[PDB]
Amino acid sequence: HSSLHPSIPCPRGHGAQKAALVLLSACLVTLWGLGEPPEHTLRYLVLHLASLQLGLLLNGVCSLAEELRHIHSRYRGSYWRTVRACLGCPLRRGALLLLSIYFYYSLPNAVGPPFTWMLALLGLSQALNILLGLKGLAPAEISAVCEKGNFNVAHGLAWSYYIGYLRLILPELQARIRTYNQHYGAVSQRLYILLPLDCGVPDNLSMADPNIRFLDKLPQQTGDRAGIKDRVYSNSIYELLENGQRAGTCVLEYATPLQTLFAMSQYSQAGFSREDRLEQAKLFCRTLEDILADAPESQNNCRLIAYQEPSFSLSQEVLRHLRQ
Amino acid sequence: HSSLHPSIPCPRGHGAQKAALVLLSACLVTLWGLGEPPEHTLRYLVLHLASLQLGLLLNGVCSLAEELRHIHSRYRGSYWRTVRACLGCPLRRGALLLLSIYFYYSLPPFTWMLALLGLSQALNILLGLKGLAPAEISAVCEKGNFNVAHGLAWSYYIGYLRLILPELQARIRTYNQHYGAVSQRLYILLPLDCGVPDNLSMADPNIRFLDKLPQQTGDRAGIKDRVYSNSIYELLENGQRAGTCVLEYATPLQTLFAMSQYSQAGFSREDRLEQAKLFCRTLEDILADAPESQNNCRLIAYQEPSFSLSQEVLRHLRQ
Amino acid sequence: HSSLHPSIPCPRGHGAQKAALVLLSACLVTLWGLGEPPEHTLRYLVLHLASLQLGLLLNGVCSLAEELRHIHSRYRGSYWRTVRACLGCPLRRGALLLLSIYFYYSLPPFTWMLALLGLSQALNILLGLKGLAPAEISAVCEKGNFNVAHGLAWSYYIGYLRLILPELQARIRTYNQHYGAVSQRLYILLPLDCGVPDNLSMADPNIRFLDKLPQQTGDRAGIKDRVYSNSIYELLENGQRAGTCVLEYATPLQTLFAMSQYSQAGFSREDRLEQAKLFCRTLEDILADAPESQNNCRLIAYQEPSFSLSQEVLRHLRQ
Amino acid sequence: HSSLHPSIPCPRGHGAQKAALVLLSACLVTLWGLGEPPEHTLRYLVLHLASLQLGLLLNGVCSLAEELRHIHSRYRGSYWRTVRACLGCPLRRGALLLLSIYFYYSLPNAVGPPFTWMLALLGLSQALNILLGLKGLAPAEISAVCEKGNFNVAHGLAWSYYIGYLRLILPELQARIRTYNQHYGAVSQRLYILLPLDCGVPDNLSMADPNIRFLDKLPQQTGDRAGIKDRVYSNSIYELLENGQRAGTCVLEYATPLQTLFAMSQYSQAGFSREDRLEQAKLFCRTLEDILADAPESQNNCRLIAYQEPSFSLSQEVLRHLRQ
């Protein structure tokens, strides 16, 4: 399960396969109840699968017509890769196509046209589906494909955040805090990152909640990156107020990628909607949590805070997590 | 068409529509040639569409059985939103379902056919007969912007370029007055191989550090005194300083390479290259439409086949 | 049974044979109960075996068509070796093939049956119907030692332990005479989580460096003056030095973790844990049978559930 | 292809699938030629596949009988994981089993016993195969599975060599060579590793070939590893002799994992044969080449030498590679 926030979706499971198994069992029971020639059941099932395979072949050919224009750039200028991407596994698909053709051209069929007439009708139906866009994928299927294939912006944002910022500072954060304390308050030993699922992320944190105010600045860290010599990473130690008293101080910061998502939502070229913004923010939080859990650099040296504004007091949540 | 590099794919067009039109024309021609009664053809076609619609309904039912668990988390506890996301539009889908059922029952067993169709759909779901080809996945991702490079490019624009391009001219003027005439453009390298070495000098001995710029300071994401820096490098030729300009390596390419190396990312090298190309293309587009950019930044893209980065940078510098 | 840790799998036994015996007994019982003529049962069984043999022959033929390309590289250009590696034993396999063909032709079409069997075998090869379950793969790998942990464990024994254990007593005696009474055993930590932090102190604040040992020198693999070192750490308890011993982290565990992180390795976390357990088990076995080891090394294995490494090490130290 | 040595096997391709496709086409052509009731072809094909699926079920049950003893340790003490590992994808396999049972119990069959009698005979055959070991995997299939699944010792040895030795020294090798040259011969700028496929690997390199003799020693490198503080990595600069003249000098070393493989071959508990030694050595060379090709640390800073003794002069090969 997920511990950051009850509103964070867990990874999709295998409920669809369970429902499919139940449906198959029910269909088999129904066919048994009907008590008609069983051979016909298998024959027509095979014919239907063959028709679907031929339709997939036609759709793949139509898609390949477009994909060929991009052979040189996208597909390394090789026709074999183009065919593989348009039709999948060439050999498996070819074997299935040959079986479908043979069975349909050979097996007697009472429901369905002969081979040539059936092929014409199938091509007609596939062309109509392509032209009218009648063949579309539901949002749930698209989301499942994206998550399974990791085709979501949040994945890239989280990996960028881990590889560009955390992976560098986190090992040296203990040393920097030690130096700051030895030279001078009694700050915590972990980095606290706030993850507003609403992606508000005000630039001036004190504006978000008066109870949090700036205290001091950690020593800067310098490192060479992307040709930019002496690139500087800096933190900011804040002080948390309870009834006007300094309850605790921590190295606190927000997640810039949430600002990026919010800005993308504001713009129009991005094609980014607010609902997509929320979904990608939740996915970003989940992915970052997983990466830090599996990461070696972060060994109880960083903590993440996730909250959703509904009455609301950021300072109270931060203090609650600190006192643990 | 993109002028950055010939190896940059262009946005997908409508060749599929043209192929569909050709297929439809040929299909109508052959249907005319066969000479069978039109009524039988219409019956067969409408029944085929009805069967497809019922299969889609069953697939949506299974997806609903799956998504009811995450109703609260992802769909905000609203059943109607879940149904919409699973089966599509409830209204149109239900109307098509009723029409399909009526046509199936009216036109000439019945229950056995429905059971067989459900069994076939279940087999498709379980064994994955009706998978999605990589081309279709790529088209869907590009159309819906369900890519990785899109987010990285917009992060780069909104975190770095949008916050230093306006002040880059002022910084360069300050450096020039304080002092080696550097150009007034930011040159960003876009290696499609996603190498991105930590130092230009190692990448090309013909390039070396010249001097930094006045660091820019700004508050960002609860971090005080966030500092953006740069590094004027000197471009050489035959040992003589040919020119100087601000040089950059697109860090998101570093991120893509690191994701490729790591197993937990689920990122392959082919995906790395494709997403790098997509990042370059979308960055070019956004900068072309950017208001902040007023021809104060130049995008340089190159691929290692031998290559001389200094020569390419100088060539872009002369123009 | 392995005494290192309860979470260490024991070598696979012969439960499959017992299950097969029970199944055979039940099958004979039901065959007796059915009462059908024995001759028909024999015919059916022998024809089934013949069909299986022909399927294996066809699979071997396809594998031969595949391996003829690598005949020169892997099989030294010998066709007979390739055939043996593909179809198994040519002599026995050919004899069984002839027997199967004769029985198929003699006992009561014929060519159609052979074509159908070939088609079924081709479908199995293409769509992968007859895949190998993970348990069978693991059993084959363990029986044939086609594992990763085996090589790492033997490398550790043959590169480090076999070259320092004989001289460890001398090194410890030299350190003691030069000077904090360190024990005369090498304590190797075996974290099944494959963490292996670079420093013990970070792993456990209750452990800190005490002193090095006299470096051992030897020539290895064309490298002169290869140096093996150690580091006596001090074990604490309530702030007082409870004991001292030479402490080690099994580097092969570091290698397994790194392989898990990297994508190019094709290594998953479950495989990482299983191979770590296998490495610990095989290391225990080889040391138990090692001539060089004369109870001068102790293997400590632990798993993080809270855990106090210092307490576990001290517990193993008292005994 | 492979460039280290023509005797290095390339990764296995998809020739088996091509042969299977050809076989399927030939079988379909034969069935067409026979011209008997096509329905029977499909019916008996389905029956045969169902029988195979039931046999796989029985074999998986027999294997599970043993695997259950290891549930707590190997399989995290969960029965579901045990069943998954014994039978594969539980839902897919269950659906196939249900289809097989239904079709066999329903479809009329002229060749083959009724459902119960057939099940008895199938269990008998599977039990006989298990008891007698008649069901075995050919060496080629085992090698393909191992390479595809990366279940070979050479994989681990190569990854250990890269992660423990190369990944550390290679970035600092240029600096060490620069310091050695500035303080004092004109050594090369790359590390040369020798990979004897025969795994001879003499400890004293000068013994291998007189023309190679020791010259000097590079500065030592120190780093903390596995709790061993100040662990030392050292190299050895040699001088290559042509006609008694110092043709060239290089930072040369052998691959210790080849020594490990040779020693494992010598022992008996290892269960390691000489042919397996050769195969794993070649696989180690190939894997290390791939890793270094994809590795960022090695940027034309290391070179590998592969040779096979058949007349033979190591110095000549090393010089030939150096002068490139």
Ligand SMILES: Nc1nc(=O)c2ncn([C@@H]3O[C@@H]4COP(=O)(O)O[C@H]5[C@@H](O)[C@H](n6cnc7c(N)ncnc76)O[C@@H]5COP(=O)(O)O[C@@H]3[C@@H]4O)c2[nH]1
């Ligand atoms: N709080 C905070 N303090 C920092 O010093 C810092 N440096 C990076 N980050 C954030 O971690 C992630 C890793 O950065 P990346 O290298 O991938 O690309 C960066 C980088 O290419 C560029 N950039 C941002 N800050 C600098 C900088 N100081 N110097 C050069 N380039 C910079 O613009 C991209 C995106 O910046 P942000 O989207 O605002 O947040 C980044 C980023 O999300 C920081 N976050």
Ligand SMILES: Nc1nc(=O)c2ncn([C@@H]3O[C@@H]4COP(=O)(O)O[C@H]5[C@@H](O)[C@H](n6cnc7c(N)ncnc76)O[C@@H]5COP(=O)(O)O[C@@H]3[C@@H]4O)c2[nH]1
């Ligand atoms: N030529 C050479 N010079 C070195 O300094 C060196 N250090 C390692 N290696 C080789 O690279 C690989 C990486 O070593 P790993 O850490 O995985 O396990 C090592 C390590 O756990 C241990 N070991 C070997 N040398 C030392 C050492 N000097 N200190 C501590 N442990 C050592 O024994 C294991 C295998 O040693 P080798 O099988 O002889 O060759 C190694 C290894 O194949 C070296 N090779």
Ligand SMILES: CC1(C)C(=O)N(Cc2c(F)cccc2Cl)c2cc(C(=O)NCc3c(F)cc(F)cc3F)ccc21
């Ligand atoms: C599962 C079952 C029994 C079923 O419900 N249908 C729906 C259906 C029709 F689609 C067509 C007529 C009746 C029914 Cl009832 C079906 C179809 C076939 C088949 O052979 N389809 C080829 C095919 C067509 F039939 C028409 C077409 F325009 C193109 C095309 F390619 C096999 C089994 C079934």
Ligand SMILES: CC1(C)C(=O)N(Cc2c(F)cccc2Cl)c2cc(C(=O)NCc3c(F)cc(F)cc3F)ccc21
């Ligand atoms: C491809 C084709 C036509 C074929 O060549 N055989 C070989 C064969 C026999 F195996 C058995 C008899 C004749 C032939 Cl000819 C076959 C078998 C079946 C079948 O139903 N097998 C179940 C089954 C058995 F038959 C016997 C048994 F001991 C156990 C068992 F589980 C279906 C199709 C075929």
